[PDB]
């Protein structure tokens, strides 16, 4: 694949998306536009298919009936030019090989690393920007609405949310909508309080692989509730949420030990 | 030029923008991305330069001292597959002159618009004739003057394009000459004191030469905030090309499609 | 709806590049791997590209001619209507090109491809032809040759010749089997391909893969073809080609008929 | 910052298409108009592309051959460092390639282009060379030939040979002036180009325009070059080339020196 022209054609297109990220500090990419990029990176058509089913095997906690999830820590390592699964750092809800060995999921990680690489952003004082590594915390999350966070940043450098599917979800333009604000919006606000003068744009995932990427230090955001289409049945929404930041600055530090039982490491560049 | 590869490469890119227009019902294209498109269509570098000066020769009416403008009516004719200057329809001293309409970057902008809007299915205004193979494009070259209002609306047409040519002493704060895009449920006539954030789709702000917003006028509402002066002691100006494109009035005042006898102009669309 | 498809214009852009190379070099060879995305961009379906590898199985067989099976048809590149159309037979005829070929969208893309390139290219004018016309005659042969256990250096007497490879059977590729040589105008008309002078050789080409395509200016190059050589000498070897002979009509001052075909009609736009 | 430039990756994507054609055909010929955007995409500046047409004016000149002016240098494709570097001279010498050429970003792009294509291409292994190595020796000649009012069919003894045209003066072209013929392995070593057999001819090319480039697998082709012909017979004719001879090191079972050049250091990445 290091010799495959479609690989480099895909990188060219991703470099164009990266220029737009630089300029706007966020991008929304339609899932139909992500598919050829991910294929070019090495995703198989069977793994794109399997991506739409992996959310069925997320962990169910009875103390959290409105969400099912798995999560894992990855490292974008720009010395080795690769991304690898890291050991658990504070367990039955770890991301499994089913997701992390999926080549389309791996393509998504490569996609994000390629875009965020080299992009100058606001530096959070608690983080170490002289490092050559990033920590990416990935959540595979199914939310469940049975018949509320306000405006915020996630405390990282780059956030990516990729839609995998949903069930009984209304697309009524107020359902699971991500609002994007400039920094002058009040970090507490709900929708009764958000000011139009501070709203940049409004996005809604609806189709497989719809992807939103945002500079978390330079936007604030909020996400409206999932609305059920058939109000009598449950609605679910399946997402991959990637939280990527530089390591914690030393004088609680991040462990960069690879995972022992669930190892994984894909090249970033070929 | 019908033989020039860069012409078809430009069309291919325009067709990608056209797909995004179909999906989102508007597009914003940065000036740096417009330039190679206009070149591929036939714009010379000298005419791109001259486009930044043509707004100095606009008509000045003492009746309105905050606007200097010229205007002209054009026809996108899809049976002759060309666009032509139409005669004046209500002597008149603020007609667009050859300085603009024979400029090849201006001509490229007309071709750009026609190619994107061609074939795009939209909401039909009852007072207009959508079985026609001709469109009326009313073009204003407009300099606004802020020497030391309209509210949320549609323009009454099918497609509106606003392209930035330049400005002087313009503040680039997040509220200076910003175009707000609203869904249809925003109240017509509302000013920014009452626009609801639930109904705000996007906001854009022209900033650089050839920044271009294109929108389906029957399926968005919009508003344009005032130009703010950087140095508050001096006047601020903003130079735009505003294209108002619609099907002709249904006959059942008719539009005249007689060509301009004194200022003819006709460029192929293809 | 292809008129709005970005890949249509991307294909045209690449075809315009090939056209510039044709103007410069007076011939071009395009590998089939490079032709496939161009034809797709023009409207060829992958089913029709597949079916193009079978149409040569239905060519006409005459006992008069045991080493060749063939069908042919006359087409018109009409640059007033900006389309290409099937013309009537011009001399009971049983070896006419059929809808199986001429309605194949990959074959149609091949015609559009050629018209797009040759359009506007200034060439040497044959005195017997009329270059004021807006119409070209394209005589197309679908030809299977058979070698079982010929012509020298020549021109075809037209303006542009295109030869596109569809397939073969038991053909030895490593040898100089079915090699097209092109020569400058000082090569001896009629010379056998073994006797051609290297000093007069302008190009050497060999179709080997599906949709390998040679296009040449027939008035400014001479050419010659070497025999098909069988890989296994004990068996027959076959080679399937589309051969497009395109020229301006004969000058009034026998004429070409431009009547469209009444029973096998066909017309597609050159530009969408 | 070119590592973030989309046109860099677009160039590479086209280079990899050429590489597949090279694998299939065991040679490729790239017209200069097609090379220019590739070299630009790799990092060639347009000023350096202009200056490449002048560097052959400063080649070394010796009375032993009044028909040849040249400079040369050894480079190493190092696929462990993923870089190409200038190596020290290995046999007092005054015809060394200078910084004028080797720091030219278009020349550097030509080196990158070659390593990118040849990398990983499986070829016939010369017994005298070491194909377990991760380094290649590239001997580059910048060469101006002079014709004023020899070698036959051969191999160069390397793995891959590239010839890029920089310019010419008073060169005839209608004739077979400075035509490169390629032959299969059954053509007779030492044959004069006038006496090669068409049945063993695998291609014929002729550099004509700035950056026309021929790459060939030297172990699986033979080749020959015809003399430069002057357009005006009463004047001298010149032809300016870059000739890249690339091979695996000599098997240690004279050894190639991989010490870097100390007066004329140069090292550029093959991949950004
Ligand atoms: Fe958040
Ligand atoms: Fe308006
Ligand atoms: Fe012939
Ligand atoms: Fe040689």
From TrEMBL, chain B:
Record GO terms (molecular function): dioxygenase activity; metal ion binding
Superkingdom of origin: Eukaryota
UniProt keyword Ubl conjugation, yes or no: no
Annotated binding of Fe(3+), by residue: 153, 155, 222
Keyword hit for Metal-binding: yes
Alphabetical UniProt keywords: Metal-binding
Protein name: Uncharacterized protein B14A6.180
Provenance organism: Neurospora crassa
Taxonomic path: Eukaryota, Fungi, Dikarya, Ascomycota, Pezizomycotina
Shown stretch of the complete protein: 83 to 383 of 393
């Amino acid at each position: 694949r290091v010799f495959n022209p479609s690989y480099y054609t895909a990188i060219a297109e991703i470099m164009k998306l990266r220029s737009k990220y630089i300029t706007n500090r966020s991008i929304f990419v339609e899932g139909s536009d992500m598919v050829p990029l991910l294929l070019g990176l090495g995703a198989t058509r069977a793994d794109l298919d399997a991506l739409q089913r992996v959310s069925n095997n997320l962990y169910s906690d009875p103390t959290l009936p409105f969400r099912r999830s798995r999560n894992g820590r990855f490292c974008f390592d720009f010395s080795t030019r690769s991304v690898r699964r890291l050991e658990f750092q504070p367990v039955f809800d770890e991301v499994q090989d089913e997701l992390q060995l999926n080549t389309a999921f791996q393509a998504l990680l490569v996609f994000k690393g390629m875009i965020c690489h080299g992009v100058q952003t606001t530096h959070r004082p608690r983080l170490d920007y002289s490092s050559d590594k990033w920590v990416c915390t990935l959540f595979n999350l199914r939310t469940v609405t049975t018949p509320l966070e306000g405006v915020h940043t996630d405390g990282v450098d780059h956030t990516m949310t990729t839609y995998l599917g949903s069930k009984n979800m209304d697309l009524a333009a107020n359902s699971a909508v991500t609002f994007m604000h400039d920094m002058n919006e009040e970090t507490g606000a709900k929708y009764t309080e958000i000011k139009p003068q501070n709203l940049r744009s409004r996005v809604q995932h609806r189709h497989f692989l719809d992807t939103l990427l945002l500079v978390d230090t330079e936007n604030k955001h909020s996400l409206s509730p999932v609305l059920p289409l058939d109000e009598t049945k449950e609605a679910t929404r399946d997402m991959l949420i990637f939280f990527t930041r530089r390591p914690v600055k030393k004088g609680n530090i991040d462990s960069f030990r690879p995972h022992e039982e669930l190892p994984m490491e894909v090249p970033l560049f070929l």
